[PDB]
Amino acid sequence: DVLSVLRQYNIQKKEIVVKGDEVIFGEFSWPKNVKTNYVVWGTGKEGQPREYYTLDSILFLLNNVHLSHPVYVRRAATENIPVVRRPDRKDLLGYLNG
């Protein structure tokens, strides 16, 4: 699963290459909008479909982790990238950083 690959690359600081709409991990590649297996907070409940974070959304959080979460939310809105919702933030960053 691509989120486990992203964890591995992030923890060992191995280069991740973004090229147009593609993300390259070593000699492997995924579309940037590939769905991870991480269900978005609030979805999959009250009869509404599960939705999953895209790889792009997670990379954008990682690249902007220095911001306070509210300012990051504004940056995601401005860049038209889905936000990682606050209830998912600590767990996702914990998983990605080990």
Author numbering: 3 to 100
Give sentences copied directly from the paper behind this entry.
Mutations of human CDC73 are associated with hyperparathyroidism-jaw tumor (HPT-JT) syndrome, which is an autosomal dominant disorder characterized by parathyroid tumors, fibro-osseous jaw tumors, cystic kidney lesions and uterine tumors. PAF1C participates in recruitment of histone modification factors and promotion of transcriptional elongation. To understand how the CDC73 N-terminal domain contributes to CDC73 functions and how CDC73 pathogenic mutations may lead to HPT-JT and other diseases, we have characterized the structural features of the CDC73 N-terminal regions and revealed a previously unidentified N-terminal globular domain. Here, we demonstrate that CDC73-NTD can form a well-folded globular domain, and is conserved from human to yeast.
Based on sequence conservation and the size of trypsin-resistant fragment, we generated new plasmids and purified both hCDC73(1–100) and hCDC73(1–111). First, we determined the crystal structure of CDC73(1–100) using the SAD method (with a soaked platinum derivative) at 1.4 Å resolution, and then the crystal structure of CDC73(1–111) at 1.02 Å resolution. There are one and two molecules in each asymmetric unit for CDC73(1–111) and CDC73(1–100) crystals, respectively. The overall structure of CDC73(1–111) is almost identical with CDC73(1–100), with a r.m.s.d. of Cα positions being 0.894 Å. Both CDC73(1–100) and CDC73(1–111) fold into a globular domain. Analysis using the DALI server shows that CDC73(1–100) has a novel fold. This domain structure is composed of four α helices and one anti-parallel β-sheet consisting of three β-strands. Indeed, our Thermofluor assay showed that hCDC73(1–100) and hCDC73(1–111) have Tm values of 46 °C and 56 °C, respectively.
